[PDB]
């Protein structure tokens with residue numbers, strides 16, 4: 001029974017918490033044990049949902065937060081509909097306006113290295129990459145940040161609020177040294 005686990009259950013939305021729990025168990029990890037990852041997954045999830053809300057009505061197809069089988073099903077349909085190359089790894093969104101998959105990153109480490117690693121892991125470069133940080137930086141492929149300023153600024157504001165609430169509970173240091 002950890003502090004971090006009760007903090008995330010009171011800081012995040014119950015639908016987020018439940019999607020994160022299902023995600024971890026699906027991949028064989030327990031939110032009561034990997035409590036920092038529990039917090040990271042909830043955070044990444046809230047950011048993906050905030051991101052897809054930044055566009056227009058039908059702009060984004062949401063891939064993250066689904067179970068692996070149906071997440072790939074929607075990808076297959078998108079690819080067999082748009083002609084876009086099927087990614088090797090599951091992305092987080094699809095942009096019907098720009099016709100590309102988006103990989104959304106939330107890092108506690110430093111802006112530049114995270115993109116590299118995630119770029120070298122993707123290693124296909126078809127899908128667009130967008131990174132956010134807990135300190136307020138962002139970085140996107142070809143410096144095309146997809147959404148307008150205010151929607152990304154809202155995402156950055158919420159990330160710093162998560163940081164503050166954790167720091168005020170002396171949980172930030174453990175979370176930062178977890179990646």
Ligand SMILES: O=C(NCCOc1ccccc1)c1nc([C@@H]2CCCN2C(=O)COc2ccccc2Cl)[nH]c(=O)c1O
Nearest residue numbers: 023024027029037040041044064090091092104105106107
């Ligand atoms: O969809 C993804 N993974 C498929 C599911 O993998 C799982 C693995 C274990 C438990 C549950 C699910 C995906 N994964 C990653 C990172 C890097 C690759 C491994 N990884 C993770 O283990 C995910 O933990 C994170 C670390 C930092 C920030 C956010 C996250 Cl969520 N980052 C993303 O932005 C992302 O969308």
Ligand SMILES: [Mn+2]
Nearest residue numbers: 064090091092
């Ligand atoms: Mn994902």
Ligand SMILES: [Mn+2]
Nearest residue numbers: 092103104105
């Ligand atoms: Mn992601």
